[PDB]
Amino acid sequence: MNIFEMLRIDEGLRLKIYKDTEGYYTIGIGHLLTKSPSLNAAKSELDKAIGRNTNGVITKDEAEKLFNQDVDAAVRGILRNAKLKPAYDSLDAVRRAALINMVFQMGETGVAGFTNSLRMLQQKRWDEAAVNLAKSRWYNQTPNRAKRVITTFRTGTWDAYK
């Protein structure tokens, strides 16, 4: 298992514009296009992202390219973030994957707000951090995926994804 396979499981793959769990226009492997309520605005963001007139449909290869770019940006965003970097640095390879997943889903700002859980993670208090992570809108809105990510942080294994 790896970050790519993990996120692919969590986000799925869709080749036509769709609405995410929050009602935002998305495509591919969890690539948010816009928070705007307009499909045209979404189609415009899509063409610009792909470099062509898509008509809201993309190919698998194009979905994967957006995916690669998004994972790279997530990692890069973590490394440039003063609140995130330290946590990330302190973790093992499996748990780092859990943190990238959260950043991929909620953005660097969102994650940077989990001040207390981050601290517990840096201290390596696995069970306590898991309880604290669960007390969030994040867990209440997408409980199954949140449970998978939490289990990953708790155990340091990929068991939740196997």
Give the span between the Cα atoms of 140 and 50, in whole angstroms. Answer: 34
Catalytic residue among 10, 11, 45, 70: 11
Interface mask (CB under 5 A) for Cl ion, residues 41-80, using x and -?
--------x-------------------------------
Position among 95, 145, 148, 154 found at the interface with Cl ion (CB under 5 A): 145
C-alpha distance from residue 4 to each of 1, 36, 72, 111, 117 (Å): 8, 27, 11, 19, 24
User: Which CB sits closer to Cl ion, 82 or 144?
Assistant: 144
Annotation-wise, does 36 bind a ligand? Answer: no
Q: Which residues contact 131 (CB under 8 A, 6 or more apart)?
A: none
* b/e burial code for range 111-133 (CB count within 10 A of at least 16 → b): bbebeebbebbeeeebebbbebb
User: Which CB sits closer to Cl ion, 87 or 102?
Assistant: 102
In the beta sheet, which residues pair with residue 16?
A: 57
Q: Does 148 bind Cl ion (CB under 5 A)?
A: no
Annotation-wise, does 4 bind a ligand? Answer: no
Q: Which residues are annotated as a binding site for substrate?
A: 32, 104, 117, 132
Residue ranges in contact with Cl ion by CB under 5 A: 49, 142, 144-145
Please identify every residue annotated as catalytic. Answer: 11, 20
